[PDB]
Design a protein around this motif. Structure first.
Motif, mmCIF file in Angstrom:
data_model
loop_
_atom_site.group_PDB
_atom_site.id
_atom_site.type_symbol
_atom_site.label_atom_id
_atom_site.label_comp_id
_atom_site.label_asym_id
_atom_site.label_seq_id
_atom_site.Cartn_x
_atom_site.Cartn_y
_atom_site.Cartn_z
ATOM 1 N N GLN A 114 0.776 -1.130 -0.087
ATOM 2 C CA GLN A 114 0.194 0.089 0.028
ATOM 3 C C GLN A 114 0.984 1.189 -0.038
ATOM 4 O OE1 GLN A 114 -3.130 0.808 -0.511
ATOM 5 N NE2 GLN A 114 -2.422 2.942 0.052
ATOM 6 N N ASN A 115 1.989 1.338 0.726
ATOM 7 C CA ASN A 115 2.678 2.283 0.847
ATOM 8 C C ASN A 115 3.367 2.682 -0.355
ATOM 9 O OD1 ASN A 115 2.374 3.117 3.651
ATOM 10 N ND2 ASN A 115 3.732 1.471 4.370
ATOM 11 N N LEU A 116 4.206 1.698 -1.105
ATOM 12 C CA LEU A 116 4.648 1.957 -2.469
ATOM 13 C C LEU A 116 3.575 2.549 -3.413
ATOM 14 C CD1 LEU A 116 6.836 -1.617 -2.807
ATOM 15 C CD2 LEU A 116 7.470 0.850 -1.947
ATOM 16 N N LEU A 117 2.261 1.860 -3.482
ATOM 17 C CA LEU A 117 1.230 2.359 -4.037
ATOM 18 C C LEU A 117 1.058 3.851 -4.076
ATOM 19 C CD1 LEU A 117 -0.017 1.020 -6.289
ATOM 20 C CD2 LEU A 117 0.529 -0.912 -4.823
ATOM 21 N N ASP A 118 1.214 4.261 -2.742
ATOM 22 C CA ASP A 118 1.084 5.686 -2.504
ATOM 23 C C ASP A 118 2.360 6.385 -3.082
ATOM 24 O OD1 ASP A 118 -1.275 5.865 -1.104
ATOM 25 O OD2 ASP A 118 -0.177 4.987 0.740
ATOM 26 N N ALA A 119 3.547 5.768 -2.924
ATOM 27 C CA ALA A 119 4.650 6.426 -3.828
ATOM 28 C C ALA A 119 4.913 5.841 -5.085
ATOM 29 C CB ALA A 119 5.990 6.030 -3.079
#
Lengths: 130, 372, 154, 358
Positions: free
Chosen positions: D256-261
């Protein structure tokens, strides 16, 4: 009475010597065990070549893919041994004979083994019996 | 010079180089040493033995237990009791063969399954009165089976075949001919439960394309026999040849719906196809042309009783096929015999097989001992 | 390639390494013995084969140096012509060749010699086999009758 | 013949042949001769067989005192070396006694069967109880140096593996698997669980993925180098479970975090580690779906308030989002059907439910 049917073709020389070979019982690679509803298990010896050249069903049954042992025994049912003997005699000599009451069995055997000549002969014979 | 000075292994080998008649009537009467040597047995072949033993079966069963293969070929004399006692006395049986023993019931095979589980090869001729209950006994007791043959056993339904397919995971061979009441369910249960299968045949059975298409799950299939089978379309055998890359022998005789396009696809995607049989297949010269131009592995091709085969197709398949050694040109009436003679004269290592050619081969083999 | 064998009587025969490799025993003893550097090509002693039989075996292996070995096939009477001409010796030499082929583990020579002996046995009554092989009939008239009775199905 | 004058010579010759003194063809042949002549006079050979068995039993049982209690470095040396020398001497003794191997032996239809097979069987009077545990713990120690530990003991481990594999039960890949593979696998799974948790505690997850992939490749190569190939599938499953599935929760969160980044490469190697776990992707699938649905929503909401009176801009924005995430599906997610499906769904979940219609 008695009916008969004779055929003349290109193998007029090979069929006679093959029949003489069959009568000598020297070279054989096909063994037919005929049985019919009570009859003895009649054992005939014959070549695959003549039976395949006279009936496509025998040719299809002889193409099993592996014939290393040479002699093969093929059990046959649903036909009387005398009818099968007459069919083999026609296959070897291009000539068959039958009684006026056994034409139906010969025709049944020929239709089962798809021998068109004797099929037509027996059809004409059954038509002439009216 | 003294033969008895040789070790008994060499003498056993020499006696093994002797026929049974010369060994039992001449060798066994030379001396007591040769008697004891020839008396030593394992695999026994009693093929048709002029049907001369019923009680001798029980005698030899009670004699020795060290039997791994029994040949009971055509054997019209003995009854089921001899087979039962022989199974009782031979637990270590590996191969069982009894062809055309139409007097044996299923009690014999029940006792066999019950008293020798180490069976690997079971070859059972016509042998009427073979119900599925003794066949499910065989399927549930002889789990170590490898080869199974039930030829023209009309008294077999799908229950016994499915029970056989459930167990016996090591079944490498299976052959059934003219066995009605056996349908696509048995073929499907055999194809998805025994991946060790290499040889399979359902000739004359009530099998359709729906059951044949399930053979794609067997990537170890080497030989396939589908002669005189009910309505097998081209796409099914196309997928069979495509998936089963280890397919070597394909038998499609008496199939009036296989065309030349199917033969072309099989020759193209048949990277390991070695033997192809297309007797009575409604095809033309295009099939042979495709086999010659596209297949670099087919050695045996049979187009016997094909109506539309002519000289040109056979000449082209003899010219374009490098691996061809046997051409099955049987009863191709539209083929001239002088052309076949020219072919056999100017094409070596290819045994063109027609009516006159095979008749000539047999006549030469007879003239070696000729007569008139 | 060169290997020097010594017979039981004191004679030395120098032959090819592969021809001795036809013998399973000789190639086994060589692979176990001389995989490393050879010790000045010391002789290999064969104390169970004399000089003449060893020479016969060397000749046979020299003639059969290109045969491709494919174990459990049908029995026939092939017996190639050169093997027949080579085995046209007396019974003593034939038995010694049998012993050498069993000792040296030469399957081809063993097969050919066993087939020759079996053909010598073939087509002969027990009295003729005993005369040609010098075997005394230790069977009484009772035991011989029991033996021929027990094999009446032929 | 005579035994008090021939046998003694034969035991002496087998003693020699069990030491790499390099004897001439005369001694090989003398011993072979002896054997042949003994079994020629159909029984004979039984005595000789028992004598061979006794010789081997005594030889092993009185070189074991040299083997017991050794340290878990020296013991591998001793076991490898003695096994090598002993298999060489066993093969050459089977060769010496081939004539007995094929005639007296064919008549067994019990215990007595073979000689080389004998030799192996007897070798299980110095392995099963004495060394097996010891030697395997030594090997596990060495392999446990998956740290800066040294290269050359590969020979020792391969020798151990070899001796266990060929000790696969001849009697009447079992030994290798019960004695070594189980404990080895257990130790490896514990090593990697401790290493995994420590790392994912004191390191970012998106270097833990790189270290897990490195360790997986490492262990594949290590099974290749000196371990039996049979130990590849199992070990791979174990290591994948330990390193990728036990931690699939932090994986989901970092996903999820990568998807945000826009750390594409990391997302890609995550979909590459996760893939190796049965049905672990579904959560990633739905997370991607929701992320790009919210992305298209926020996009076209940053676009139109009174700018929905601009067909182009709207369809552009939509196509932009679609293209970016289609590229991300292709490159990172290997065009997986699950992720293409998530893309399609999430696109069909923002195109006709936005502020341009509401």
């Amino acid at each position: 009475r008695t009916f008969s049917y004779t055929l003349e073709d290109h193998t007029k020389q090979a069929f006679g010597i093959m029949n003489e070979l069959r009568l000598s019982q020297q070279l054989c690679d096909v063994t037919l065990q005929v049985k019919y509803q009570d009859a003895p298990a009649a054992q005939f010896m014959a070549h695959k070549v003549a039976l395949a050249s006279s009936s496509p069903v025998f040719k299809a049954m002889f193409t099993n893919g592996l014939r290393e042992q040479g002699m093969e025994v093929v059990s046959i049912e649903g036909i009387h041994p005398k009818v099968m003997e007459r069919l083999i005699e026609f296959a070897y000599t291009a000539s068959i004979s039958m009684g006026e009451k056994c034409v139906l069995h010969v025709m049944n055997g020929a239709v089962m083994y798809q021998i068109d000549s004797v099929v037509r002969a027996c059809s004409d014979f059954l038509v002439q019996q009216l | 010079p003294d033969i008895n000075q040789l070790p008994p292994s060499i003498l056993l080998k020499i006696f093994s180089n002797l026929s049974l008649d010369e060994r039992c009537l001449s060798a066994s009467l030379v001396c007591k040493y040769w008697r004891d040597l020839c008396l030593d047995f394992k695999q026994l072949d009693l093929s048709s033995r002029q049907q001369v033993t019923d009680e001798l079966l029980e005698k030899i069963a009670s004699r020795s237990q060290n039997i791994i293969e029994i040949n009971i070929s055509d054997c019209r004399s003995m009854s089921d009791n001899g087979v039962c006692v022989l199974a009782f006395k031979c637990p270590g049986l590996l191969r069982y063969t009894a062809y055309r023993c139409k007097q044996l019931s299923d009690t014999s095979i029940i006792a066999v399954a019950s008293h020798c589980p180490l069976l690997q090869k079971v070859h059972v001729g016509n042998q009427d009165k073979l119900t599925d209950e003794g066949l499910k006994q065989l399927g549930s007791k002889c789990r170590e089976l490898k080869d199974i043959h039930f030829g023209q056993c009309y008294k077999i339904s799908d229950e016994g075949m499915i029970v056989i397919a459930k167990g016996c995971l090591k079944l490498q061979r299976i052959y059934m001919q003219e066995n009605k009441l056996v349908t696509d369910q048995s073929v499907k249960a055999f194809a998805e439960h025994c991946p060790e299968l290499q040889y399979v045949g359902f000739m004359g059975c009530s099998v359709t394309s729906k059951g044949v298409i399930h053979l794609t799950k067997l990537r170890n299939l080497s030989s396939l026999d589908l002669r005189h089978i009910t309505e097998l379309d081209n796409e099914t055998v196309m997928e069979i040849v495509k998936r089963c890359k280890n397919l070597s022998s394909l038998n499609l005789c008496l199939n009036w719906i296989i065309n030349d396009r199917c033969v072309e696809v099989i020759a193209k995607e048949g990277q390991n196809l070695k033997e192809l049989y297309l007797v009575s297949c409604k095809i033309t010269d295009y099939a042979l042309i495709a086999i010659g131009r596209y297949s670099m592995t087919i050695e045996t091709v049979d187009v016997g009783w094909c109506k539309e085969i002519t000289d040109q197709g056979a000449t082209l398949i003899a010219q374009s096929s490098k691996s061809l050694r046997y051409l099955g040109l049987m009863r191709c009436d539209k083929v001239n015999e002088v052309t076949v003679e020219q072919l056999v004269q100017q094409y070596p290592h290819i045994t063109f097989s027609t009516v006159l050619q095979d008749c000539k081969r047999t006549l030469e083999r007879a003239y070696q001992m000729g007569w008139t | 390639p060169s290997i020097k064998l010594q017979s039981s009587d004191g004679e030395i025969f120098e032959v090819d390494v592969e021809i001795a490799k036809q013998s399973v025993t000789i190639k086994t003893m060589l692979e176990d013995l001389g995989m490393d550097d050879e010790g000045d090509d010391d002789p290999v002693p064969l104390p169970n084969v004399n000089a003449a039989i060893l020479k016969k075996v060397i000749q046979w292996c020299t003639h059969h140096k290109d045969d491709p070995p494919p174990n459990k096939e049908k029995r026939t009477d092939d017996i190639p012509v050169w093997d027949q001409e080579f085995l046209k010796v007396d019974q003593g030499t034939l038995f010694e060749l049998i012993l050498a082929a069993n000792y040296l583990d030469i399957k081809g020579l063993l097969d050919v010699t066993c087939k020759t002996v079996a053909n010598m046995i073939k087509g002969k009554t027990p009295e003729e086999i005993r005369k040609t092989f010098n075997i005394k009939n230790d069977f009484t008239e009772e035991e011989e009758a029991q033996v021929r009775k027990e094999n009446q199905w032929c | 013949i005579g035994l008090d004058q021939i046998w003694d010579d034969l035991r002496a010759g087998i003693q020699q042949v069990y030491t790499r003194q390099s004897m001439a063809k005369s001694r090989y042949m003398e011993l072979y001769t002896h054997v042949y002549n003994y079994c020629t006079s159909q029984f004979v050979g039984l005595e000789l067989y028992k004598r061979l068995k006794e010789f081997l039993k005594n030889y092993l049982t009185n070189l074991l005192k040299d083997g017991e209690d050794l340290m878990d470095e020296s013991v591998l040396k001793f076991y490898t070396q003695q096994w090598e020398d002993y298999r060489f001497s066993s093969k050459v003794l089977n060769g010496i006694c081939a004539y007995l191997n094929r005639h007296w032996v064919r008549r067994e239809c019990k215990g007595i069967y073979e000689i080389y097979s004998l030799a192996l069987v007897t070798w299980r009077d110095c392995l099963f109880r004495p060394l097996n545990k010891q030697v395997t713990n030594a090997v596990l120690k060495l392999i446990e140096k998956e740290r800066n530990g040294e290269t050359i003991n590969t020979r020792l481990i391969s020798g151990v593996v070899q001796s266990y594999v060929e000790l696969g039960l001849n009697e009447d890949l079992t030994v290798y698997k019960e004695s070594f593979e189980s404990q080895f696998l257990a130790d490896t799974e514990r090593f990697y669980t401790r290493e995994s948790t420590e790392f994912l505690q004191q390191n970012p997850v998106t270097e833990y993925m790189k270290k897990a992939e490195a360790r997986l490749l490492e262990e594949q190569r290590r099974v290749q180098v000196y371990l039996h190939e049979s130990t590849q599938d199992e070990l791979a499953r174990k290591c994948e479970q330990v390193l990728i599935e036990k931690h699939l929760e932090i994986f989901h969160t970092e996903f999820q975090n990568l998807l945000d980044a826009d750390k594409n490469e990391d997302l890609g190697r995550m979909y590459n580690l996760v893939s190796r776990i049965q049905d672990g992707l579904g959560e990633l699938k739905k997370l991607l779906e929701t992320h790009i649905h919210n992305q298209g929503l926020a996009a076209i909401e940053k676009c139109g308030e009174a700018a929905l009176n601009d067909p182009k801009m709207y369809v552009q924005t939509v196509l932009d989002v679609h293209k970016k995430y289609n590229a991300l599906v292709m490159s990172a997610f290997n065009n997986d059907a699950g992720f293409v499906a998530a893309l399609d769904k999430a696109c069909g979940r923002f195109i006709n439910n936005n502020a341009v219609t509401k």
